[PDB]
């Protein structure tokens, strides 16, 4: 059995069993995170050891633990009690979603805030929002959420239309206490609804959209074996799934003639953070680590054929653990299919008389998740020509506020009285590289402009320069779109037939990075977002750019501490961390539900192959 | 009849007739360019005047002329003899393709160059290459082409595989003279072939690609009326076609309820230039103005159903003039269809219980052209949500050279002895804007970072600043990807329901602009390429960023001279010229035929609509 296979339901139950027998999962315990670990380097030969790692919350106030078990051997490998004031709180539990509203409903300061606004407490939804780390010393070591109110005029109303500004509350989830209720002033609660299925607001639905039928009459060109192993148009890989990261891709390789050549050992979105840019004390603390704090895999949608995923779809239904260690299946939580992708290569040659046209295809592996108001589609594409791509599709409902009467430098207007604060959605792709194997390096490549003169008399020449990143202390890089900057991962010990090192070139979109002041809390907690590209030496415990426990962690953790080890990355097992994000100044067209907007990156072969790798593509039927 | 309808065959014949009767098209005359002119501003009401503009070459050495005729009225509106030494030579004629080889075949200096290399003159193909303007005073006023040799080992061989380096020749096309033959040294003629249909090099073709069937069982959702008028999912526009520019889009508008709101009056690629970066005197002169020198519309491919254009395709077969004024149909030279485009908007709301998913579509209008070794697909997309996009798909066979033995700072290696010089492919999109009508302005929008402190105590705030471009002297702008710079075209007299000016935001890719030294010939002839965005006041004779006659024109013409008029562009009929390009350092995978690579831009509504414009999209069948 492939040691990269998906966790099965029986594997989760065995973790539950091992923890129970070990005395680690009594009735007061809640699993906040559970996931299989990747096989260790070199273990390929031989003998399974499927290890699972668990974060265990205790609802009685006892200390939480990090536990690794061996489902293979039925043992506890490690169990450590965590001092959350130092190393962070556990991830948010799904069971804590409703607690913030429930505690506030009977708090007299909250009820007073709502009475001044003539709002019925029974119609006041409270978003359970991650707290971060600011000035409130009582919160250190405590599991806090913060709450912002949204009025639901009726049970199928969109509360996002009716933010209650000037009001925020903090609660201690464990002790079940409201620690602070801040009311800075009354704002009108925007009156319009945002119900995008209401015929009054949609108007009569269009009748003009004729059907588009996409079918594969002989079925798809990719095979799935071993539960999650894909073979498609020379690509080979395994599709993993982790409750924190979502879909992960393992062992991406390309059959080049008779050789299976590795390209990327592990590909994941290791963090995704939404910083807000509104300096109001009602929201100036909000930074939602969708991945590290909430666990995006956990909230993956079940994707409906014909509507969520069109064409000939093959699904995976990954398993996760519920809060008590029982397996739960996410039905149709991963969609897989191949698509047409236009012209691959075309040339009509006058001299030879030959006219040639070939079509491209891509393999698509995706999931869609929902974190409160946000919805994101994570898409990995593999193309016939070797190009690898990632794309995020950001949609959902924008996070709202009041629109101040004097306007705002940090908030857009969507509807009368309704604002939407400025924010970014910033991702980190963790690419554990394996270009032709693990001995890799990274070069930064800039265009070079040349001055007209001797050896360049007509002033037309231009060139490129590549700079090797030799050690981690040199591997924190920024974009330079003006100089066409890219980063090439090569194998300096593997040369193509032209005696040049095989490589792949990372093409970024060069969007703005984290805008927050460098002295801010979020710049410290999300340092990775402040730079476009990081290279580290591989290490099995360096998994997320933000560290293991993001929630209410003071800062510094993660990449800035990994990098300080100043390890050799010049022909070594290395990891590329690419920051990329969307800067979102909301527009009216984003309201009441926003059209998808996208961000991502791609890697293209750069002398990896001896010549084009798609010459064996046949003329289309 | 819509005055934006395509030229018909009868219209071309009537031009021929009018010129013949007027004494302007005797047997020594060759039409180098012919195209309908756009209706003048305000002529909507009323009465046709279909005017055509013609550039007439004279093969006897008499001066060429620029002529505008009225096919409506059967008259010559204007005819002016051109002093090509001042205002430029005419565009390259298709009939001149073979002349460069034919003249050189019997020239003793050329034959000597080839004999030293043991090449059979009968197997030596010569690319007819535009000359530009350099140090050769004898060329001023003369119609010159330059030639580079490529060996074809047999009639169906790819000559690009066998460049003959160290050798270039210049010829006077009219006098039929070889003006110079420069032989700077012998290089090996690369030996490998590049025949991508040869089973020896492709290997056995793949059998793994299962079929993908895309159909529309009730036909497409767009209608074509009046020959070229498209109605699709609230969009309205006309598809034009000009032999120089290719597909042009007129009168792009969006039905918003009961109003037809204009967005863009005219959209075209007004120039496309390929500068080379190899300082060798054999190629340091090459800069191929595919649009302005060669006329891309002229070489549009006939696009084959199922292979070039998949799905339910509606074609236009535009008409052009041959060199004698006879109409010629480009069969299936424009493909039109709609496609699925993934998720449009999705949200799964916990509080309201509603789960919502809608799919996107785009309308696609494209053509594909071949200029020697290059092939380009020009694609215009319209999306349901109002986004407009352009994409170029660059493929074909890379222009080759020898690979020097000591390597090269300006040339990649593709195969033993085979080089491909560095180059860029730089486009200019001419967008004659009409945001809600003609009274428009442009603002440059940058992200603003804020310093932590008073009014921003937690250091999270960020904002934006918009700078109006008031006059043409302020409207030459450059990218700043780091600050998320975009440009917003608004109508300062048309406000959405929130009292904010309607607009569209141009999202560029922020690729490098022209790399050549600012003092170089190409920087002067292609000044537009040196900056990302230009705004001019509309004027009916300001059509191309490079002027009317690009071929062998000394420089300065075009945008830098338009801009100097310093006209008011703050709430006026304006035109946005966006430079965008690909910088191409060829890779081994580009050889022997290159996979498509892409570049483009998009515009997104920015407060143009009162709320999302796709709320009336129905749940998919
Ligand atoms: Cu957003
Ligand atoms: Cu190129």
PDB file of C-alpha atoms in Angstrom, chain A residues 429-512:
ATOM      1  CA  UNK A 429       2.432  28.004  -1.178  1.00  0.00           C
ATOM      2  CA  UNK A 430       4.852  25.517   0.375  1.00  0.00           C
ATOM      3  CA  UNK A 431       6.633  23.753  -2.480  1.00  0.00           C
ATOM      4  CA  UNK A 432       8.977  21.060  -1.223  1.00  0.00           C
ATOM      5  CA  UNK A 433      11.016  20.882  -4.419  1.00  0.00           C
ATOM      6  CA  UNK A 434      12.451  17.734  -6.043  1.00  0.00           C
ATOM      7  CA  UNK A 435      13.673  18.856  -9.478  1.00  0.00           C
ATOM      8  CA  UNK A 436      14.898  15.570 -10.949  1.00  0.00           C
ATOM      9  CA  UNK A 437      15.392  14.513  -7.330  1.00  0.00           C
ATOM     10  CA  UNK A 438      16.178  16.233  -4.056  1.00  0.00           C
ATOM     11  CA  UNK A 439      19.589  17.849  -4.751  1.00  0.00           C
ATOM     12  CA  UNK A 440      18.258  21.306  -5.684  1.00  0.00           C
ATOM     13  CA  UNK A 441      19.133  24.993  -5.713  1.00  0.00           C
ATOM     14  CA  UNK A 442      17.351  28.282  -6.414  1.00  0.00           C
ATOM     15  CA  UNK A 443      18.546  31.202  -8.533  1.00  0.00           C
ATOM     16  CA  UNK A 444      16.948  34.617  -8.745  1.00  0.00           C
ATOM     17  CA  UNK A 445      16.761  35.662 -12.412  1.00  0.00           C
ATOM     18  CA  UNK A 446      16.460  39.310 -13.454  1.00  0.00           C
ATOM     19  CA  UNK A 447      16.397  40.854 -16.912  1.00  0.00           C
ATOM     20  CA  UNK A 448      19.498  42.926 -17.559  1.00  0.00           C
ATOM     21  CA  UNK A 449      19.359  46.064 -19.637  1.00  0.00           C
ATOM     22  CA  UNK A 450      22.518  46.938 -21.529  1.00  0.00           C
ATOM     23  CA  UNK A 451      23.897  50.374 -22.364  1.00  0.00           C
ATOM     24  CA  UNK A 452      24.472  51.243 -26.012  1.00  0.00           C
ATOM     25  CA  UNK A 453      28.149  51.232 -26.868  1.00  0.00           C
ATOM     26  CA  UNK A 454      31.182  49.076 -27.598  1.00  0.00           C
ATOM     27  CA  UNK A 455      29.985  45.524 -28.208  1.00  0.00           C
ATOM     28  CA  UNK A 456      26.393  46.899 -28.310  1.00  0.00           C
ATOM     29  CA  UNK A 457      26.698  49.671 -30.867  1.00  0.00           C
ATOM     30  CA  UNK A 458      23.011  49.815 -31.846  1.00  0.00           C
ATOM     31  CA  UNK A 459      21.747  49.668 -28.252  1.00  0.00           C
ATOM     32  CA  UNK A 460      19.477  46.651 -28.777  1.00  0.00           C
ATOM     33  CA  UNK A 461      21.155  44.035 -26.595  1.00  0.00           C
ATOM     34  CA  UNK A 462      19.574  42.750 -23.441  1.00  0.00           C
ATOM     35  CA  UNK A 463      20.347  39.818 -21.208  1.00  0.00           C
ATOM     36  CA  UNK A 464      19.608  38.059 -17.897  1.00  0.00           C
ATOM     37  CA  UNK A 465      21.483  37.427 -14.659  1.00  0.00           C
ATOM     38  CA  UNK A 466      20.992  34.489 -12.297  1.00  0.00           C
ATOM     39  CA  UNK A 467      22.003  34.728  -8.644  1.00  0.00           C
ATOM     40  CA  UNK A 468      22.331  31.532  -6.641  1.00  0.00           C
ATOM     41  CA  UNK A 469      20.729  31.643  -3.204  1.00  0.00           C
ATOM     42  CA  UNK A 470      23.462  29.793  -1.316  1.00  0.00           C
ATOM     43  CA  UNK A 471      22.179  29.837   2.276  1.00  0.00           C
ATOM     44  CA  UNK A 472      18.957  30.557   4.093  1.00  0.00           C
ATOM     45  CA  UNK A 473      20.297  33.964   5.216  1.00  0.00           C
ATOM     46  CA  UNK A 474      20.292  34.986   1.522  1.00  0.00           C
ATOM     47  CA  UNK A 475      16.954  33.358   0.613  1.00  0.00           C
ATOM     48  CA  UNK A 476      14.376  35.982   1.641  1.00  0.00           C
ATOM     49  CA  UNK A 477      13.502  37.633  -1.664  1.00  0.00           C
ATOM     50  CA  UNK A 478      11.085  40.224  -2.982  1.00  0.00           C
ATOM     51  CA  UNK A 479       9.464  40.686  -6.366  1.00  0.00           C
ATOM     52  CA  UNK A 480      10.743  43.048  -9.055  1.00  0.00           C
ATOM     53  CA  UNK A 481       8.156  43.018 -11.826  1.00  0.00           C
ATOM     54  CA  UNK A 482       9.960  45.833 -13.663  1.00  0.00           C
ATOM     55  CA  UNK A 483      13.028  43.605 -14.156  1.00  0.00           C
ATOM     56  CA  UNK A 484      10.950  40.521 -14.973  1.00  0.00           C
ATOM     57  CA  UNK A 485      12.248  38.766 -11.859  1.00  0.00           C
ATOM     58  CA  UNK A 486      11.587  35.010 -11.535  1.00  0.00           C
ATOM     59  CA  UNK A 487      13.142  32.216  -9.496  1.00  0.00           C
ATOM     60  CA  UNK A 488      14.531  29.049 -11.077  1.00  0.00           C
ATOM     61  CA  UNK A 489      14.713  25.780  -9.140  1.00  0.00           C
ATOM     62  CA  UNK A 490      17.397  23.607 -10.748  1.00  0.00           C
ATOM     63  CA  UNK A 491      19.254  20.362 -10.065  1.00  0.00           C
ATOM     64  CA  UNK A 492      22.959  21.281 -10.357  1.00  0.00           C
ATOM     65  CA  UNK A 493      23.873  17.576 -10.667  1.00  0.00           C
ATOM     66  CA  UNK A 494      21.421  16.727 -13.475  1.00  0.00           C
ATOM     67  CA  UNK A 495      22.054  18.189 -16.922  1.00  0.00           C
ATOM     68  CA  UNK A 496      19.961  18.065 -20.041  1.00  0.00           C
ATOM     69  CA  UNK A 497      21.486  16.897 -23.323  1.00  0.00           C
ATOM     70  CA  UNK A 498      22.829  20.415 -23.919  1.00  0.00           C
ATOM     71  CA  UNK A 499      24.921  20.177 -20.721  1.00  0.00           C
ATOM     72  CA  UNK A 500      22.791  22.778 -18.877  1.00  0.00           C
ATOM     73  CA  UNK A 501      21.162  22.128 -15.459  1.00  0.00           C
ATOM     74  CA  UNK A 502      17.547  21.010 -15.540  1.00  0.00           C
ATOM     75  CA  UNK A 503      15.131  23.484 -13.975  1.00  0.00           C
ATOM     76  CA  UNK A 504      11.685  24.952 -13.463  1.00  0.00           C
ATOM     77  CA  UNK A 505      10.979  28.690 -13.403  1.00  0.00           C
ATOM     78  CA  UNK A 506       8.464  30.148 -10.953  1.00  0.00           C
ATOM     79  CA  UNK A 507       6.349  32.872 -12.578  1.00  0.00           C
ATOM     80  CA  UNK A 508       4.678  35.021  -9.935  1.00  0.00           C
ATOM     81  CA  UNK A 509       1.910  37.559 -10.382  1.00  0.00           C
ATOM     82  CA  UNK A 510       3.836  40.223  -8.374  1.00  0.00           C
ATOM     83  CA  UNK A 511       0.841  41.505  -6.469  1.00  0.00           C
ATOM     84  CA  UNK A 512       1.379  43.655  -3.357  1.00  0.00           C
TER      85      UNK A 512
END
